[PDB]
């Protein structure tokens, strides 16, 4: 697995709550992704990737090499482990807490020149998944613009996750989430069209 480093280019915002607002500038402190961050590109033709308060995931492989994810402290046993393995025929979010099963959950919607921008969050025993698909031209690097992410699935796990691993030729971008305050601009229809990172530069500090 080769590892390259690239730029985020102000991508990866999401709706912070399930309420509606129109033409109102609103400030939110949450687990966000900083603008112009050092997002890490992986090409797989393989250690466990570190987990630190939510992971942003992007991919361009349309033939579904990246199937699922395996979480936990260790790999197989001796701790509390997770298994969110998915396939392509039917979309299943089958979650196992075998390591002695204590949490099982299945539901349909996880998956539906395309960006599958995902955000995984683990706060206070609550696991939240944000997902958004986006068309792209000039598929190298990351596009410039704004495309918000929407809430998909919540789960009551109730463990630690400190390591995560994708399930596999493939190329994907992994970005790391930090607690951060954003200033989001709601449109007339309720669409997030613009956002200001409140701790990026003094001009954005003045804007906030």
């Amino acid at each position: 697995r080769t590892q390259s480093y690239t730029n985020s280019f102000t991508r990866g915002v999401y709706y912070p709550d399930k309420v509606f607002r129109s033409s109102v500038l609103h400030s939110t402190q949450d687990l966000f992704l900083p603008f112009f961050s050092n997002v890490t590109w992986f090409h797989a033709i393989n250690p466990a990737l570190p987990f630190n308060d939510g992971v942003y995931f992007a991919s361009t492989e349309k033939s579904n090499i990246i199937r699922g994810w395996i979480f936990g402290t260790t790999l197989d046993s001796k701790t509390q482990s997770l298994l969110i393995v998915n396939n392509a025929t039917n979309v299943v979010i089958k979650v196992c807490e075998f390591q002695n099963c204590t949490f099982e959950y299945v539901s349909q919607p996880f998956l539906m020149k395309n960006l599958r921008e995902f955000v995984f969050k683990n706060i206070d025993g609550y696991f939240k998944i944000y997902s958004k698909h986006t068309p792209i031209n000039l598929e190298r690097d990351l596009p410039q613009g704004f495309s918000a992410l929407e809430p998909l699935v919540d789960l009551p796990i109730g463990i630690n996750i400190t390591r995560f691993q994708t399930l596999l030729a493939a190329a994907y971008y992994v970005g790391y989430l930090q607690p951060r305050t954003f200033l989001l601009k709601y449109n007339e229809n309720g669409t997030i069209t613009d956002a200001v990172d409140c701790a990026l530069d003094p001009l954005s500090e003045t804007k906030c």
Partner: protein, 369 residues
């Protein structure tokens, strides 16, 4: 309003008129299932506090008022809500956590405390909402030879996160020598067993604790209590109860483009501008009922007892909260004074270029420019 018996000539703003609600509507989702609180509060045994079970409850008609008939407990100790107000409003999901501790640590089941249970067995968050139930079990979980089926964890490297478990049994490293799975000097087992006996004091007796954790209404409501629904009405000032959200207003169709994951719509000053109906998937607006201000225009009480009423800021095809005179002004409109096509000096000011006065040639209150 002036706290006097004599009122001199002028204009006085007095109170506020507001149209009253006529009926009340309650909207609840159609749920007929009964979730089993009975199987949570009746069990042969409860799990240990290091291995506390968690039961998720949704799609229920949660009857809370019957919970006092299943277990003999004094205080239904709630932290976020009221114990007697659980049958009206409703939630998203319920979580039930059941375990057994000793009587010295039952005060430790509280948001934001430091000890043994709250640090290494069961930690509650600082923003915790829900209720805690505790009752004595000296006749069920105590043995004269010693009941050792209940254990708890007292050694750990770090304090527990809120709402998480740690059931791994590894030998504690209390020094520098490696334990290698063998207990002895500076290598202690993390689980220590309770030693419950019926001859102990009241503080060492075993207590059964059931914690109900609630989630606020931000998602679509899955569990709601036994309140009967009411048929929907529109274009009238009504008292509405939408999934426990109580308000007063008038409902209209909304052309707002709500997303499928959004249930509420918010204003600048935190007011519910729009609501999604739980039974049919429809978006409704909330507008407050008609209001304004009332001003009384009078001469002195030594002159006459006739007054005029100015309703401020309202169009007055809607007056109901002499009486045959209504003149439309810019500052609301005027009832009780007639408009003339003349011009004098301003006696009592009213609004944008309109004044009022008392005239003799029958005496009456007239309004002019």
């Amino acid at each position: 309003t002036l706290k006097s018996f004599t009122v001199e000539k002028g204009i006085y703003q007095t109170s506020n008129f507001r149209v009253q609600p006529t009926e009340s509507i309650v909207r609840f989702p159609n749920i007929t299932n009964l979730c089993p609180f009975h199987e949570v509060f009746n069990a042969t045994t409860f799990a240990s506090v290091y291995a506390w079970n968690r039961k998720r409850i949704s799609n229920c008609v949660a009857d809370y008022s019957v919970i006092y008939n299943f277990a003999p407990f004094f205080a239904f100790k709630c932290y976020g809500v009221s114990p007697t107000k659980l049958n009206d409003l409703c939630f998203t999901n319920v979580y039930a956590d059941s375990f057994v501790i000793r009587g010295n640590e039952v005060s430790q089941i509280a948001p934001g405390q430091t000890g043994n249970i709250a640090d290494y067995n069961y930690k509650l968050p600082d923003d915790f909402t829900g209720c805690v139930i505790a009752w004595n079990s000296n006749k069920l979980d105590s043995k004269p030879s010693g009941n050792y089926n209940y254990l708890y964890r007292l050694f750990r490297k770090s304090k527990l996160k809120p709402f998480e478990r740690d059931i791994s049994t590894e030998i504690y490293q209390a020094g520098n020598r490696p334990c290698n799975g063998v207990a002895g000097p500076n290598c202690y087992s993390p689980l220590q067993s309770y030693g419950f006996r019926p001859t102990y004091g009241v503080g060492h007796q075993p207590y059964r604790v059931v914690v109900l954790s609630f989630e606020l209404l931000h998602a679509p409501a899955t569990v709601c209590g036994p309140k009967k629904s009411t048929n929907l009405v529109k274009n009238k000032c009504v008292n509405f109860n939408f999934n426990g959200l109580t308000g007063t207003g008038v409902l209209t169709e909304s052309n707002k483009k709500f997303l499928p994951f959004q249930q509420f719509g918010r204003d600048i000053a935190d007011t519910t501008d729009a609501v999604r109906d739980p039974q049919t998937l429809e978006i409704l607006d909330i507008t407050p009922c008609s209001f304004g201000g009332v001003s009384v225009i009078t001469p002195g009480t030594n002159t006459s007892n006739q007054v005029a009423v100015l309703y401020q800021g309202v169009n007055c095809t809607e007056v109901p909260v002499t009486g045959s005179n209504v003149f439309q002004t810019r500052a609301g409109c005027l009832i009780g004074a007639e408009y003339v096509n003349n011009s004098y000096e301003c006696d009592i000011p009213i609004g944008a270029g309109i004044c009022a006065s008392y005239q003799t040639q029958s005496q009456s209150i007239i309004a002019y420019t």
